[PDB]
């Protein structure tokens, strides 16, 4: 009586979500630099978003935010490169706080 790994992968929320393009996700600000919030949203890599000029003080560690994902991982192959160069971070648009 054990759920298979295939079952878990099939029924996990990340699999439920289709292509990450323009999907809406709920991220968590797990680390903040002066004006750069590092937001984890459950994906393999976090995203980095500038603190909004409006209510920027309202964003703090653990502040749950809404993001529009453009890519789970930012990668691309370049002229002559054998393997894709990855910046090890997702590309997401910060929409605001969630309550």
């Amino acid at each position: 009586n054990v759920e298979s790994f295939a079952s878990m992968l099939r029924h996990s929320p990340l699999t439920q979500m289709g292509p990450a393009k323009d999907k809406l996700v709920i991220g968590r600000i797990f680390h903040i630099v002066e004006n750069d919030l590092y937001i984890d949203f459950g994906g393999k890599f976090h995203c980095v978003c500038r603190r909004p000029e409006v209510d920027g003080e309202k964003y703090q560690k653990g502040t749950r935010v809404r993001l529009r994902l453009l890519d789970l991982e930012l990668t691309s192959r370049f002229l002559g490169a054998t393997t894709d160069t990855t910046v090890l971070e997702a590309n997401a648009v910060l929409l605001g706080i969630q309550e």
Binding site: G80, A81, T82, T83, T85
Partner: protein, 53 residues
């Protein structure tokens, strides 16, 4: 006849233009210091890999 009596205005304009050129030179020099050094520093952190790991 190269006499300053009437040229006063043009000569003053010449001096002002030279001063403006020098000031613009200084401002450009200071403002110049993405620069190639910073861009290359960024690139080195993500080197092109034409071989296999």
């Amino acid at each position: 006849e190269f006499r300053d009596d009437a040229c006063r205005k043009e000569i003053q304009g010449f001096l002002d233009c030279a001063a403006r050129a020098q000031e613009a030179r200084k401002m450009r020099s200071i403002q110049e210091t993405l620069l190639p050094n910073k861009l290359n520093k960024l690139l080195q952190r993500f080197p092109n890999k034409p071989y296999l790991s």
